[PDB]
Design a protein around this ligand. Structure first.
Ligand SMILES: [Ca+2]
Ligand SMILES: [Ca+2]
Ligand SMILES: [Ca+2]
Ligand SMILES: [Ca+2]
Ligand SMILES: [Ca+2]
Ligand SMILES: [Ca+2]
Ligand SMILES: [Ca+2]
Ligand SMILES: [Ca+2]
Ligand SMILES: [Cl-]
Ligand SMILES: [Cl-]
Lengths: 154, 154, 154
C-alpha cells in the first residue's frame, strides 16, 4: 500500500500538471494567442494605473507594452478604447521607461505629446501613457481611469 | 524517505491549486468579469428552465439574476435575446422568488407583465421570467426554451 | 501519521480533478459549446495545413470537420474567413478522407470544386480543403496558409 499509493499519487499529480498545462494552452488559443507571439487581454474595465498594475500582476502578466508597430496595433485591437500602457515617467520627469525597466525602444507619440499637462484637474502633471483607438500615444494622469490590458509572454 | 516525499508532494499539490486559481481568474478576466462584480456568461443555447438550472448548477453557478440596474444591464448585454432569469412564482402566483431564496426586490417588467398567460397548452401558466433585448422582463412558461445565461459570484 | 496524510492527499487530488473538470466545462461553455455538440475554436491565425494539424493535436482536438450543414455553419461562423478542414485526398488523389479516418460523406463543394489545381505555384496540386466565407468548400494546396480552427468532442 503506502509506497505504491504514494507512487501512484506522484503519477496523479504529474498527470494533473499536464492537464492544467493543456487547459492553459487551450485558453490562450481561444483568446487569440498566436504562435510565438505575446498576447494581450482585457476585461474592458476602466481604472487608475495603479489598479491596472495590481490586476495584471495578480494574473502573472504585466501592463501591455507595445515594443514595435505590430504590437501597437495588436493592443489597440484588443482595447477598443483608450488604454494604459506599461510606460511612465514617474521616476524622472520627461524620461519615460517601461514598468519592466529601461528606456523606450519604440514610440508612437501623438502630435504635441508628451507634455505633462496639468489642466486635467486631477492634480499633478501626466506621468502615465495611453494608447488611443487610432494607436497613437498620449501621456495622461496615472489617476485617470482607462482600459486595463494585460500582456502575457510569447 | 516516505515523509519527505510526502511533504514534497503536498507542496506540489499546493502549487497546482494556486495555478488553477490563477487559470480561473485569468479566464474570468478574459470573459469580461469586472472587479468586484458578478460574472455573467453564455454559450447561446436555448432550453427549458429546469435544464438551465441543471446546466448552471453543473458549472457551480446559478441562472442569472439582475439584482440591480447595472446587473440587469450586464445580463441583457451578454444574453443578446430572451434568456431565463433565476426567478419563479410557483409557490404563490404573483409572488416571484429568487431561485436562490428570497422575495423579488429589483424589477424591470414590461407593461401587461406579468400576465401569467395560462393558455399556451404546454404546461400550466407562466411561472418563469425572461429578460429580453430591451431589458424588460416578461413572465414565461417554465417549459419554454430560452437562452441559458449563468452568473458567478463577485 | 503517514496514512492520514496519504488519505488527505488522495482527497486533495480528487478535489483538484473535480475543480479542473469544472474549469474545462466553464471554458467550453464560454467558448460557445452547445449541449451534446462538439465545439469549434480559433485563435484567428493563418498557417499551412501541417501546422494546424500539429496545433490542434497539441490541444487534444482535431482540425475542424463538418459532418452536416449545422456543423458546417458552426465552423463558418467561428472561422470568419478561409479555414482548413480535416479533409484531404493526399493518400489517394481524388478520394477525400477525414484526418481521423474514413471516406468523406457530407460535402459542400463550391461549383467546379474539387479540381486538383496546379496553377497556384505552391507546387503539386490541391490535396487539402478550405471552407470559405459563404460556407462552400474549395480544395487548396496544403502548403497555403489558412485559418486554424480546431474541433473538440461533444
Ligand atoms: Ca487513478
Ligand atoms: Ca510626466
Ligand atoms: Ca498629455
Ligand atoms: Ca405565474
Ligand atoms: Ca407573459
Ligand atoms: Ca486541506
Ligand atoms: Ca487532390
Ligand atoms: Ca481547387
Ligand atoms: Cl500622473
Ligand atoms: Cl496539396
Amino acid at each position: 500500500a503506502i509506497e505504491v499509493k504514494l507512487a501512484n499519487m506522484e503519477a496523479e499529480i504529474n498527470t494533473l500538471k499536464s492537464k492544467l498545462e493543456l487547459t492553459n494552452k487551450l485558453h490562450a488559443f481561444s483568446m487569440g494567442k498566436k504562435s510565438g507571439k505575446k498576447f494581450f487581454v482585457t476585461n474592458h474595465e476602466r481604472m487608475p494605473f495603479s489598479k491596472v498594475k495590481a490586476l495584471c500582476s495578480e494574473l502573472r502578466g504585466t501592463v501591455a507594452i507595445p515594443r514595435n508597430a505590430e504590437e501597437n496595433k495588436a493592443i489597440q485591437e484588443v482595447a477598443k478604447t483608450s488604454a494604459f500602457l506599461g510606460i511612465t515617467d514617474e521616476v524622472t520627469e520627461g524620461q519615460f521607461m517601461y514598468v519592466t525597466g529601461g528606456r523606450l525602444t519604440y514610440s508612437n507619440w501623438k502630435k504635441d505629446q508628451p507634455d505633462d499637462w496639468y489642466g486635467h484637474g486631477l492634480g499633478g502633471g501626466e506621468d502615465c501613457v495611453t494608447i488611443v483607438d487610432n494607436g497613437l500615444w498620449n501621456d495622461i494622469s496615472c489617476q485617470a481611469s482607462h482600459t486595463a490590458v494585460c500582456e502575457f509572454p510569447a
